[PDB]
Structure formats: structure tokens, C-alpha cells
Design a protein around this ligand. Structure first.
Ligand SMILES: C[C@H]1O[C@@H](O)[C@H](O)[C@@H](O)[C@H]1O
Ligand SMILES: C[C@H]1O[C@@H](O)[C@H](O)[C@@H](O)[C@H]1O
Lengths: 163, 163
């Protein structure tokens, strides 16, 4: 099934994609998983604006913003009501054991993290995020491993950036 | 110490660099580690030609050729006498445990691995190898991790390319 719509199982394998939300279109609905997921999600906004909701709180994500949703965290977000669209790339994954230090991002609220590269590094992170999606969507024997690897690269580039 | 000159103490840390050998220049001598090293080395020729020696045998490496020298493997190589130069990028490393299946390369002799990406892949491996060096020579606290990550990517890109 389409991972962008209900009925798709996210569990142990990495899954990546682009959710091109456009007002009034087929994807114009909120992600609403109050019990969270069985793995992590990294979300990069590439167009428009999204609104991330969590127990009454709202945070507007804009192009270049990267959000981190650890397992069990509430997933409640969708296109900002005042924006015509919210295109966001995302990657669902289970981390390698040693990735945890790099998964500690400052929370906008609850345990939903946020990282935004500075303008100089925006293109590189966006490019890298796209590579993750391309790899994650491959069917090759090493596709998932490559996606995992690229995601590790992103986490490390962030570690470099914040430092 | 300059890792480009004999006597530099290698160890568990990844070290990467460019050895721009020019005929009669300060790097115009052969690497001669007849009992090998504790770690692995990936070598990418980027300019000129090198001659890799092993118990009387010689292999001429050219731009685009990637060599793998596993621990204990003889290192005996230098600028090909017919070449004005031999610029090679290299990365000395201890692999992550799970990389084992990606480090079993076809040998030119003994257990000296060889990988020549096809024409389409060449630029990608060239760029990736350059990223490894860039990361590996980085100043940051995550430079080594980033180099290791990029190396893993190269290994996986090779697995992907040959599969
Ligand atoms: C796991 C993945 O599921 C898709 O349906 C959503 O569009 C995306 O934001 C992300 O939550
Ligand atoms: C580990 C590294 O050491 C340098 O001195 C060499 O120029 C290079 O080929 C590689 O062997």
C-alpha cells in the first residue's frame, strides 16, 4: 500500500518518502498517531508550512526545518491551515545502537526534536535528505543499508553543525 | 607528524589523505610496509600511475582504480617509473564489525583487493573518496565518525555497484 495513506505497516524496516500535501488534495489530512510509532521519524519540510500539534501546543515548521519523532511520541501534524501546501520528506527507521547520542535533539515540546541547518548548510542537508529518500526507496539488496548509512551521515552532519 | 612520510604512528584512528607524488619531489619514494599494517587501507589513484609490487609481481594502478589492503597485506607501492606523478587518495581504518562482507574483494595478487568502478560510477566514487578525505582530515569531534560513515557508504556503493 501507499505509505502516505492509512493501511501501511511501519515496523522494523526503513521506509522513506515525500508527502506532497496540497490544500484540498488527496493528501490534505493530518497524520494522527497519538500512540506513536514503532521507530523514529525524521521529517524535513521542503515546501509550504506544517503545523505540529502536541497536547494543545502547536509549532509551525517551515522549509529547511528538520523534526525528529522518537518511537511512541505523538505524531499529530499536517499542512498549516494558512499555507497552500506542506511538502515534507520523511524517513521512518530504527537506529543503530550507537546512534542514540545523535538522536538527542532539543524538543519543541514533549520529546519532538528539531534541527535546522544554517543557511550555508541548508542545501547540503536537503541534498542529503533526498539521497536518503532515493536510497530508502530502492529495492536493491543494499538499498536499506545505504539509506541507513545516509541517515547516519545526516545525524553526523548535524553533530558537526551544532558543534 | 606527517602521515605522508614513513615513521608516522598509525593506530586505531582513521587517517585519510592525498599523497601527491611528483617525480623527484619529497614524496617520490615507495611505501614499503612488507609485513603490512594493523588496519585496512583503501587507495584511489587520482592522477598519474602507480606501481604496486608484491613478491616480484607488479600491478600498474591508474586513475579511478581502487585498491584494498587488508591488515597484514604487503604495502609496496610508489609512482610508476614511467609516470611523472602518482597522486593517490587513501584512508587507513579499522572497520565496523558488519563491514566484513563488504571487504572481500577480488585480488590483483595475494589478498590485495581491486575495484574499478565502471564509467558511470567513476565520478561518484571519486567524489565520495574525496568526501572521505575531507571528513577524515576534518578538525571536528565528529570528523572521524563522518569519515567512517562515508567509507561505509563507499563499501556499500561498491556492493550495490557489483550486485
Ligand atoms: C511515516 C510517514 O507516514 C506518512 O503517511 C506521512 O505522510 C509522513 O509524514 C510520515 O509520518
Ligand atoms: C597510510 C598512508 O600512508 C602514506 O604515507 C602513504 O602515502 C599512503 O599511500 C598510505 O599508505
Amino acid at each position: 500500500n501507499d505509505p502516505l495513506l492509512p493501511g501501511y505497516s511501519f515496523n522494523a524496516h526503513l521506509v522513506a518518502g515525500l508527502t506532497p500535501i496540497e490544500a484540498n488534495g488527496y493528501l490534505d489530512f493530518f497524520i494522527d498517531r497519538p500512540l506513536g510509532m514503532k521507530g523514529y521519524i525524521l521529517n524535513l519540510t521542503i515546501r509550504g508550512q506544517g503545523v505540529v500539534k502536541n497536547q494543545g501546543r502547536e509549532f509551525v515548521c517551515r522549509p529547511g526545518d528538520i523534526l525528529l519523532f522518537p518511537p511512541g511520541e505523538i505524531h499529530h501534524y499536517g499542512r498549516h491551515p494558512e499555507a497552500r501546501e506542506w511538502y515534507h520528506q520523511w524517513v521512518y527507521f530504527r537506529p543503530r545502537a550507537y546512534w542514540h547520542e545523535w538522536l538527542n535533539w532539543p524538543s519543541i515540546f514533549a520529546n519532538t526534536g528539531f534541527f535546522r541547518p544554517d543557511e550555508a548548510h541548508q542545501p547540503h542537508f536537503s541534498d542529503l535528505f533526498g539521497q536518503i529518500i532515493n536510497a530508502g526507496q530502492g529495492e536493491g539488496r543494499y538499498s536499506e543499508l545505504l539509506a541507513i548509512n545516509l541517515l547516519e551521515q545526516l545525524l553526523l552532519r548535524r553533530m558537526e553543525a551544532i558543534n
